[model samples]
Target: SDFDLIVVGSGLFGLTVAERAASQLGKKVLIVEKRSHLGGNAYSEAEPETGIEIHKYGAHLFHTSNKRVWDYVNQFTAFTGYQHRVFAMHNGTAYQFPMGLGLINQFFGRYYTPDEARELIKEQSAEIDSKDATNLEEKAISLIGRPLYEAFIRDYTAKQWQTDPKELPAGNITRLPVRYNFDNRYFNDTYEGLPVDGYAQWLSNMADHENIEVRLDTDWFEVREDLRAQNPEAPVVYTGPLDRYFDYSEGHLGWRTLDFETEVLNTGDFQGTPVMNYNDAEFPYTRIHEFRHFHPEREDRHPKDKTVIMKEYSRFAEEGDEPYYPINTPSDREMLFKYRELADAETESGKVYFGGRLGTYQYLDMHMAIASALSMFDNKLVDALK
Candidate 1:
């Protein structure tokens, strides 16, 4: 069957594109996902013992500043207002994240206001010549100074990225936002929430239109030529890895994948907070997540019976594992440039347009993916037929 567009992958990007194409533009769309379910990495399910919804791959907190994208998602599912505050454990003590005044005070056993905290942090740093930082260590030291970076970010980042923080590009450290006041919310966004029915259900609802059909567990390569032949005249939206699309001719990009260690405990709650980062290098897991805590409204579901917790471990992306975060080092950028060149060549030959994290080879949270799709639908798909 011919479609106005064939969206490869039913993740946030594909589903959002499908919804907008069909609903707004009145175009026929088909979404095919290699995974068995629609949500891709965002899929979540409940543990019977804990009544906690476990993120099958990893936890995804939906937060966005874009109002249109925020409202669009609300059409499918009610959002449980969630603030993603995180904690870090270091030297047998726990501190709230983003390296604020409260955490610094707690670490030092002294009370400090925002202004005092800022001065104290500077006093702790060693005198250095070059304030113009290049590497992650310098970037961090410049932001929160040395002591706080050593306490919170240094080891944690090393474990997360599997590299010496100093060796990493400064861009990664810049991504970590430093707050002055006591606001501990992880994401700085206007809208922050989780899908009331889990992210998968929300995605299913979003792509449920008659004009939008989805095929799960269908690999794109398996029917790549067939899809092109059947809909030769139609445009295609490719959401797979940018490097993989060109068969790694330029070279493969580096990625960090994740593995989860899940445990069910007979307890009221696993962790007091939804997420806690094990900042020390001794701990094998990076963070422990208590899924039930995400939904405060469903607190009645767990009455001292049990709860489920997952310990997330980050590892370098090997052959078989799914790529989660891109390691955008200098070499990776060069290879990506080559891939972009090839992609442009393919585009000139007709039939393909890339979108989403893998397609663009940039880290994107869920809401950013939706925003990208909305922009594509508005700009590209509007007059695509013409």
Candidate 2:
């Protein structure tokens, strides 16, 4: 079968591109999802025992600076106000994350004015002569001092990235905000919330249109040759892993996949918060997510003799594990650029284009993914699909 445009992978980026191409530009689009589900990583379902909808992949908190993107998402599903206030478990106690003024007071067991906390932290940290520091360890020590870095950032980052702090680029730690004010919200964005009906429903509704055809359990490799042969002039948007698309010619990029150990307990609430980060290195898993907190509307399920909790553990993405995050290491960057060159060369020879988290080989949040797709629809696929 031929389509005006064929989109590989039905995640946010793929669906966004397909929907825009069909609805706005009036193109016949066919979307193929390698996974059985339509929502991709954004898929969420409630455990029957606790009625808490666990994020099957990981905790996805929607935050965006773009109002258009935020408003656009709301059109598919009702928005529920969900402010992400995270906690980090250190040693045996849990503390507010991002280390705000309140956490400083709690960490030292004394109330401190903002100015006082700043001065103390400055006095403890080394004042290096050079303005530029070398690695992640030095960058963090320069900002929050060694004590705080060792306690909060060091081991946790090491575990998350699967590399020692000294080996990581300085830019990584510098991106983390250590504020002096009382803002406990993790992200400072113009809009933030979760879809009231759940993420999958929102995505499924977004792709629901007369011109868009969604097929699950479909492999692009199985149909690519036939589709290309039938519609040689039509444009193809590939969103699967770039390596897989190219048959891993340049070698696979580094990614860390995750698996969950889920448990449903007979209680109204198991953990007080939605997410708890296990900061210390003692625990193999990174964090624990409590599902009921995401949706209070289902509080009846919360009290009905159960709650759902998922412990998240990170592992190197093997042959069959679900890939969650790209490591963005130096080697990966080099390989990605090589792939980009090959892709551009191919583009000159054909009408195929690539975008999205995996296709572009970068970390992209939901809003970013949508924006990229929209831009691609306008610039690349408009005339090609016709």
Candidate 3:
């Protein structure tokens, strides 16, 4: 066979697998991407006028506690020490996020110590048991009380998912963090930063090996029959939606997609931060991203008179729309089980491997996607190629 593996996506998962196979196993790998670009949603490029790097899909902050993933990505590009912080706009006020002391002090007009804050939350949230909460709203009220939930999470989550919080699963917010201190960092991972050059450059470097061939603007389903006919024994690593791969045999899985409206403003700054969550119902968009603030080290090179911003709107995904987050309702879970059975049958033949966020119908950060691909390479692809 001409190629040992066919990777059906050029995102982080596919690139990681292709790079490892090409460099380690000395196998020829073919990577097919539906879009013209290679990096998928993590792709970023400089704005034409100001040279500010803008995350095309939205803001993607890389943070992980996995040492292996951290080292693997560092091989391609260095990282910047960029810690992420988000501010929420609620009823004409900008508050720090993550339900911390910064927000509590401002809302109540009095500072409280850690113990005092905990006692206050305990008194307010005494109405519900944390372990027995059934829905998202109940779980939130149990954790932080109704006052905070109504102020911070209620409208914002409603806008983000287009579903009532009471209807959503409690598992959706299992790890919702509430800090009694003034810390407002968005992520709690040990490793946190942005790529030194940019996301596109780092991703492209991963696929730059001699034995890896990337074909962009090509759909795998269109050429899948021909490839399988030519290389009958070649193993395929599919990173697309599992339901779509099987032609929706069970049913269409629920998904939420984001719509970003980007514009170049004639000012130096728009929001003074990379991300700002709009917690009010009056705003149609959920968040706004100021691209220039992502890389403050390059502020000197960026234009002093202009900046770029993107407004993000969330909604249910249509048939042709690109799926972002899995809804994972109870019915969606039932449908996913049937698809998993079919996927397992394909894997049993040692000819197919389904991996990555869309392939597994789960939300994955950049580091998680890379870590998953590394796992598949070690456990599945290594033996299959040999």
Residue-pair clash count for candidate 3: 0
Candidate 2: list runs displaced more than 4 Å. Answer: 127-132
What order do candidates take by lDDT, descending?
A: 3, 2, 1
Worst 10 residues of 1 by lDDT: 122-131
Count of clashing residue pairs in every prediction: 0, 0, 0
Q: Once superposed on the true structure, which residue ranges of model 1 sit more than 4 Å away at CA? A: 129-134, 169-177
Model 2 scores worst on lDDT over the 10 consecutive residues at 124-133
Pick the lDDT winner. 3
lDDT: which is higher, 1 or 3? 3
The positional error of residue 83 in candidate 1, measured at the CA in angstroms, is 2.0
Total clashes for model 2: 0
Cα error, candidate 3, residue 153 (Å): 0.7
Q: Report the lDDT tens digits of candidate 1 across residue range 1-386.
A: 57888999878988888888888878888898899888778888777665678887889898989888888889999898777889888888778776777786788788888888767766765443235778778877776667777878788888888889888766664444446688888888999888887777897898899998898899898998998889888788889888888888888999999999899987867669999899989998899998878888788766566778899999999999989998877899898888888888786687587889888898888988988888887777777744
lDDT of 3 by residue, 66-164 (tens): 999999999999999999999999989999888878898888789989888888888888888988899999999988889888998889899988989
Question: Per-model C-alpha lDDT, please?
Answer: 0.82, 0.83, 0.91
lDDT of 2 by residue, 1-386 (tens): 45788888988999999988888888888898988889788887766654567788888888999988888788798878888889999898899778878778878789778899888677756653115768888888887777788888888887787788998777775444568888898889989988888887899898899999998999999988888898777788888898888899999998898889998776767778989999899998889988888777667645666678889888889998877789877788899999999989777688779888888887789999998988888787776765
